[PDB]
Amino acid sequence: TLRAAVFDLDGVLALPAVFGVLGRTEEALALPRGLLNDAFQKGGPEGATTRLMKGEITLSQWIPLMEENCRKCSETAKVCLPKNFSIKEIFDKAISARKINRPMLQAALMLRKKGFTTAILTNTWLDDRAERDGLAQLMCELKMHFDFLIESCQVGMVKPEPQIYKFLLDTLKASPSEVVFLDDIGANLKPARDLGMVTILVQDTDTALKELEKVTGIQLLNTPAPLPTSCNPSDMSHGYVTVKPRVRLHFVELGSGPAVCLCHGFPESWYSWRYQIPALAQAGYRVLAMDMKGYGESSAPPEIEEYCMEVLCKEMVTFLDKLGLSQAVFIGHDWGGMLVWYMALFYPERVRAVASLNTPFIPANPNMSPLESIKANPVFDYQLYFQEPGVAEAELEQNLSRTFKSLFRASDESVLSMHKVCEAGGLFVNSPEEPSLSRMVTEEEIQFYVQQFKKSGFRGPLNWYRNMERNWKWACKSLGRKILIPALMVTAEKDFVLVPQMSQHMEDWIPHLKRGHIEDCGHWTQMDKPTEVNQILIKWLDSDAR
Amino acid sequence: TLRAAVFDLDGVLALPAVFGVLGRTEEALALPRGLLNDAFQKGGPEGATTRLMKGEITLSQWIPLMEENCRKCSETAKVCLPKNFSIKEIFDKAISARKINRPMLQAALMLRKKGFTTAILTNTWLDDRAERDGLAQLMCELKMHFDFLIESCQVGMVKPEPQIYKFLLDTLKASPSEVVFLDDIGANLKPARDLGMVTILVQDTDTALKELEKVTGIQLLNTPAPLPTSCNPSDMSHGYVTVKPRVRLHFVELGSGPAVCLCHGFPESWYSWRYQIPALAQAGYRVLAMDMKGYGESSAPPEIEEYCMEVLCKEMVTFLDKLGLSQAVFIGHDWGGMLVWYMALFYPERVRAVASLNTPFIPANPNMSPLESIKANPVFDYQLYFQEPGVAEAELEQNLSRTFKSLFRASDESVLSMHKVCEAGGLFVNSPEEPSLSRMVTEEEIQFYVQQFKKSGFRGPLNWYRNMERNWKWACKSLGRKILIPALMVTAEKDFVLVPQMSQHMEDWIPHLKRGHIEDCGHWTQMDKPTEVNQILIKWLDSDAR
């Protein structure tokens, strides 16, 4: 029974193989066949390329030794190299062309999910070229998906020396017959096969995956597309900023580039952005995913007026000041979406761009109190239930597992009647005590929210709903303004509270507004349709925010 | 007795005044005198500019109303505006030209140091132009130096309405005769003077500062240049990353832009970079100042081999992986400087650029154990004293205040004989029990280090010295490599341990090395000559790392 799978980087996990670019260079420049491959291997174990792969010299030190090898090879072949011949140019473009072989990476991820330990065993070099960041970026995306990354230049050994295969087995803690080894170079499979390992010679990807399916007994080809990479809380960088005495904000941070601030809704967490955080960082952004005030590890003062929009927005500005950020892109969902529109309206100089998921921008009506507008629409009756301090807290904190299992559901799995909540005497009065698990979340994901709400409870989060009059008075000061910075509104077809039709007149206030729309998507947008959300945000960020 | 000073932004803290650029535009375009100033003030309290300053409309909404005002003014003056006339272009360049009036800012900082509460009271607008980041950046540098920032567009009031002066006094908690008010516009001083405040009309900076000196009785003009801005620990964003089980690294983070990682020496803290962190962030860098392993809030395992260079460097790579950083500029001092040279040698793809303060790169000698090389030089005798576990710990932890007061001294204030430390039986055997305070540090700064070392003690920090053989064996693997990425070596004239002469052959290994040299500077480079360090690092970062 196989339990480990080892992959080579060049020619297996990343295509095209740098070695294959030497063949293409020979044809393009009309050089004798194999000339560049002979210069590359010149000297064997005592040669310059072996010294490079063992980490004795760097790539920049090797480049002139390879040029010397090219001339000595062309001298015996009785040929002349062109005047513009450059090993640096050839290798720079070969490394640049190399991209992740997505089907191979997906097969490795599927095997890891099914219990396999996975590793990359590669012959590679210490890259000190001015363009080395491109390679560093490639290695970073790859290494996060594998249990082990063994590089020849770090261990002083190279394939096909039998010592590196022994080192591999010691690292994996497995016997040879428990390992599948994939490589595009035949000479590299020979020692693995002598040990008794299963070997797959990789010529084309599809045939290699067909062989891999047959030995593992696991379907890898023709399977559904997987969900985006989700992040593990214990692997994140956690940040804490004190914005004022007794008010500290917690956030998770990933990536480099323009700052993007993610603002969750009710009753959520920074964890509600788990599928967006790796995708946005990989697209070239520095992601800051907040625990909003009243939630998780951020401070939760009991006073109602600590959660009015004017105070929340001032603290978010202080948060940027203390981090040394002149601007950030603000992306919000639900209550966070409301906050991001007010950030654009009152502090436009600090907001690079603004996006809201589900929450529309609706201007304040100076002739009508918001408490009267809410009574007219029966779907917002639960907001009246949330007004009296202590009432909704007691119900929502009684059983945390029940609370999160009943709320976090897809649109076709609804278990909560959101009508006559006040008359019924509660949110969960005609609801099951043990609801089934939604297809959207796992038990482990529910337990993360349960643990976060054991710390401060629902008082802080519910206080966001208890400043209707204060928010309305403050918003009335902005009625003469327009939002003229880059903006995105994303509607969710099946959000039965924040309906797409509530956003129809936004163009009157944000004349250059961009739109996104997600079909078959309910209220919990980020975890309901993560791939669709990622694609919409990344496209908009790349065109209007960078 | 005065106890508060209020400054205007435009024409006082930032020059040239945006209002004065209208006068220059009229002369350049040969328009009638005062034409642009009349259009700007057109309508008075009911006018477009008053609505802008009150926050009713944004700058982009105001621009076409000002253009309309310009045409109506030119119609009554019987003149024609040129075809290329643009209010946007005029205002864009006026805002761009405005820079901090350094002598005025220095006078405000001196008053704040002497006990005064300081504030900015300004007539300003909500800037939503595509170029608004330049203004946001200006406001961020300024606001950190003042107790209060009162902006007209945020409070709905404008100078010279008497309501804003009443609001100012309520905010300051002071009576009118305790306030000095500086403004370049005469009409704005009138209400402050009616209340009984001291007013200074600002035409030229030097005369305004002479008047300010006379009323406060404090010297502001002709004083020595102040030290760089230092940061307050409670105002920083603190980050925590788990690099492996039981090993968590703490860092402080400030700024946006290319990542710069600061690595302290022994026995120090992230706090040793207090004068560099605000300067590097202001220059356009995202600064990450570490608590190295064994120190402050980072994990401190007791095992010696947890502090060998191979393990420390691997953890720093994992730190970049978990933060989502493909590369960082590495800047080290003392033991941190040694680590940064090994990062460049073993992980060049992750290092954008490398700088060391005091610590030279000295290649390993494969023919001689490092323990024998140390015995030949009598100045490194204290490193032999540090070898036996428990001995130096007991002496250094006995009195923490004495330990840091004896070490952190300028070169002319030395109280420690670094010769025959082993024979003497200790580092502080012929040293005072209560040493005087060095001119380099304050009692408050010493107490920060005292508190940090009360948590884990000296075991972790001293373990960095107890892996000589392990480090030497690992370094021998790099003897065939050269450092070919951008590099800076900064020598300190009066470091009597890490002497400038120890770095003389570095060019053999780092052929493109850049150099810096600080005269009259001892071992504690960052806090001994902070302005000189800042200037050298910023110039190098701007040319070779960005």
Q: What is the CATH number of the domain that holds A209?
A: 3.40.50.1000
Q: Which of B295, B449, B465, B495 is catalytic?
A: B465
Is A60 in CB contact (< 8 Å) with chain B? Answer: yes
Q: Which of B127, B183, B291, B334 is catalytic?
A: B334
Identify the burial level of B80 via C-beta atoms within 10 angstroms of its C-beta, where 0-12 means exposed, 13-18 middle and 19 or more buried: exposed
Q: How big is the CA angle at A275 (ends A270 and A281), to the nearest 5 degrees?
A: 85
Distance from C-alpha of A240 to C-alpha of B237, rounded to nearest angstrom: 6
Distance from C-alpha of B227 to C-alpha of A97, rounded to nearest angstrom: 50
Would you say B408 and B523 are in contact if contact means Cβ atoms under 8 Å apart? Answer: no
Is A321 in CB contact (< 8 Å) with chain B? Answer: yes
* CA-derived radius of gyration, chain B: 29
Task: Say whether B324 and A60 touch across the interface (CB within 8 A).
Answer: no
What is the 3-state composition of chain A as percent helix, strand, coil, each rounded to the nearest 5?
A: 50, 15, 40
Q: Which of A291, A334, A495, A528 is catalytic?
A: A334
The per-residue b/e assignment along A230-254, b for 16 or more CB within 10 angstroms, e otherwise, is ebeeeebbbbbbbbeeebbbbbbbb
Residue A172's contacts (CB-CB under 8 Å, 6 or more residues apart) are: A4, A6, A117, A119, A148, A179
In a domain, B224, yes or no: no
Task: Say whether B324 and A61 touch across the interface (CB within 8 A).
Answer: no
Q: What is the CATH number of the domain that holds A506?
A: 3.40.50.1820
A366: preceding bond cis by omega (within 30 degrees): no
Q: Are residues A374 and A479 in the same domain?
A: yes
Task: Say whether A238 and B239 touch across the interface (CB within 8 A).
Answer: yes
Task: Say whether B477 and A137 touch across the interface (CB within 8 A).
Answer: no
Residue A145 is among the residues annotated as catalytic for this protein: no
Q: Are residues B333 and B370 in the same domain?
A: yes
Distance from C-alpha of A57 to C-alpha of B174, rounded to nearest angstrom: 70
Q: Are residues B208 and B243 in the same domain?
A: no
Q: Is the dihedral of CA B386, B390, B393, B395 positive or negative?
A: negative
Token digits of residue B541: 């970062």
In a domain, A143, yes or no: yes
DSSP secondary structure code for residue B64 in this structure: H
Helix, strand, or coil (residue A495): coil
Q: Give me the number of domains chain A comprises.
A: 3
Nearest CB to B143 within list A56, A241, A321: A321
Residue A523 is among the residues annotated as catalytic for this protein: yes
Task: Say whether A326 and B234 touch across the interface (CB within 8 A).
Answer: no
φ, ψ for residue B162 (rounded to 5)? -60, -20
Q: Does the annotation list A232 as a binding residue?
A: no
Task: Say whether A132 and B477 touch across the interface (CB within 8 A).
Answer: no
φ, ψ for residue A517 (rounded to 5)? -145, 130
Distance from C-alpha of B228 to C-alpha of B526, rounded to nearest angstrom: 11
Q: Is the dihedral of CA B12, B13, B16, B21 positive or negative?
A: negative
Measured between CA atoms, the residue of chain B closest to residue A245 is: B234
Method: X-ray
Identify the burial level of B489 via C-beta atoms within 10 angstroms of its C-beta, where 0-12 means exposed, 13-18 middle and 19 or more buried: buried
Q: Are residues B6 and B26 in the same domain?
A: no
Name the domain boundary from A73, A96, A119. Answer: A96
Helix (H) / strand (E) containing A488: strand A487-492
Nearest to B482, CA basis, from B498, B506, B502, B503: B506
Q: Are residues A22 and A1 in the same domain?
A: no
Distance from C-alpha of A406 to C-alpha of A415, rounded to nearest angstrom: 6
Distance from C-alpha of B458 to C-alpha of B267, rounded to nearest angstrom: 8
In a domain, A134, yes or no: yes
Distance from C-alpha of A81 to C-alpha of A35, rounded to nearest angstrom: 11
Q: Which of A275, A342, A385, A465 is catalytic?
A: A465
Distance from C-alpha of B520 to C-alpha of B27, rounded to nearest angstrom: 52
| DSSP result, B243-308 | EETTEEEEEEEE-SSSEEEEE--TT--GGGGTTTHHHHHHTT-EEEEE--TTSTTS---S-GGGGS
DSSP secondary structure code for residue A227 in this structure: P
Q: What is the CATH number of the domain that holds B33?
A: 1.10.150.240
Is B350 in CB contact (< 8 Å) with chain A? Answer: yes
Q: How big is the CA angle at A210 (ends A205 and A214), to the nearest 5 degrees?
A: 145
Residue B521, phi-psi category: left (phi > 0), alpha (psi -120 to 50), beta (remainder): beta
Residue B523 is among the residues annotated as catalytic for this protein: yes
Measured between CA atoms, the residue of chain A closest to residue B245 is: A234
φ, ψ for residue B402 (rounded to 5)? -65, -45
In a domain, B265, yes or no: yes
Q: Are residues B74 and B204 in the same domain?
A: no
Distance from C-alpha of B148 to C-alpha of B122, rounded to nearest angstrom: 11
Q: Does the annotation list B184 as a binding residue?
A: yes
Task: Say whether B321 and A135 touch across the interface (CB within 8 A).
Answer: no
Token digits of residue A499: 């309906």
Would you say A102 and A16 are in contact if contact means Cβ atoms under 8 Å apart? Answer: no
Q: Are residues A285 and A380 in the same domain?
A: yes
Name the E strands within B87-126. Answer: 99-100, 117-122
Is B546 in CB contact (< 8 Å) with chain A? Answer: no
Determine how many CB atoms are found less than 10 A away from the CB of residue B422.
Answer: 12
Chain B residue numbers with beta carbons less than 8 Å from the beta carbon of A254 are 323-324
In a domain, A226, yes or no: no
Residue type at position B62: W
Task: Say whether A324 and B254 touch across the interface (CB within 8 A).
Answer: yes
Nearest CB to B239 within list A237, A324, A325: A237
Distance from C-alpha of A253 to C-alpha of B324, rounded to nearest angstrom: 9
A160: preceding bond cis by omega (within 30 degrees): yes
Would you say A388 and A520 are in contact if contact means Cβ atoms under 8 Å apart? Answer: no
Identify the burial level of A493 via C-beta atoms within 10 angstroms of its C-beta, where 0-12 means exposed, 13-18 middle and 19 or more buried: middle
Q: Are residues A83 and A108 in the same domain?
A: no
Distances, alpha carbon A61 to alpha carbons A523, B17, B294, in Å: 57, 56, 36
* Resolution, Å (one decimal): 2.0
* Helix/strand/coil (H/E/C) assignment for every residue in B196-223: CCEEEECCCHHHHHHHHHHHHCCCCCCC
Distance from C-alpha of B339 to C-alpha of B342, rounded to nearest angstrom: 5
Distance from C-alpha of B270 to C-alpha of B230, rounded to nearest angstrom: 13
Task: Say whether B133 and A323 touch across the interface (CB within 8 A).
Answer: no
Is B281 in CB contact (< 8 Å) with chain A? Answer: yes
Distance from C-alpha of A392 to C-alpha of A413, rounded to nearest angstrom: 23
Nearest CB to A256 within list B136, B255, B259: B259
Test the B interface: residue of A52, A135, A256 with most B CBs within 10 Å: A256
Question: How many residues comprise chain B?
Answer: 546
Name the domain boundary from B155, B185, B217. Answer: B217
Q: Are residues A308 and A190 in the same domain?
A: no
Q: Are residues A257 and A159 in the same domain?
A: no
Distance from C-alpha of B47 to C-alpha of B290, rounded to nearest angstrom: 53
In a domain, A228, yes or no: no
| DSSP result, A51-106 | HHHTTSS-HHHHHHHHHHHHHHHHHHTT----TT--HHHHHHHHHHH-EE-HHHHH
Q: Are residues A246 and A202 in the same domain?
A: no
Would you say A54 and A158 are in contact if contact means Cβ atoms under 8 Å apart? Answer: yes
Chain A residue numbers with beta carbons less than 8 Å from the beta carbon of B88 are none
Distance from C-alpha of B25 to C-alpha of A223, rounded to nearest angstrom: 68
Look up the domain containing A125 and give its range: 1-16+97-217
Distance from C-alpha of A251 to C-alpha of A277, rounded to nearest angstrom: 12
Distance from C-alpha of B285 to C-alpha of B541, rounded to nearest angstrom: 9
Question: How many residues comprise chain A?
Answer: 546
Name the domain boundary from B80, B96, B112. Answer: B96
Q: Are residues A33 and A139 in the same domain?
A: no
> How large is the angle between the packed helices B162-172 and B186-195, nearest 10 degrees?
60
Distance from C-alpha of A119 to C-alpha of A122, rounded to nearest angstrom: 10
φ, ψ for residue A201 (rounded to 5)? -85, 120
Residue B4 pairs in a beta bridge with B117, B179
Residue type at position A331: I
Longest Cα pair distance anywhere in chain B, in angstroms?
96
Would you say A217 and A182 are in contact if contact means Cβ atoms under 8 Å apart? Answer: no
Nearest to A295, CA basis, from A477, A504, A458, A489: A458
In a domain, B421, yes or no: yes
Distance from C-alpha of A140 to C-alpha of A120, rounded to nearest angstrom: 13
Measured between CA atoms, the residue of chain B closest to residue A277 is: B324
In a domain, B369, yes or no: yes
Token digits of residue B163: 């309501």
φ, ψ for residue B210 (rounded to 5)? -65, -40
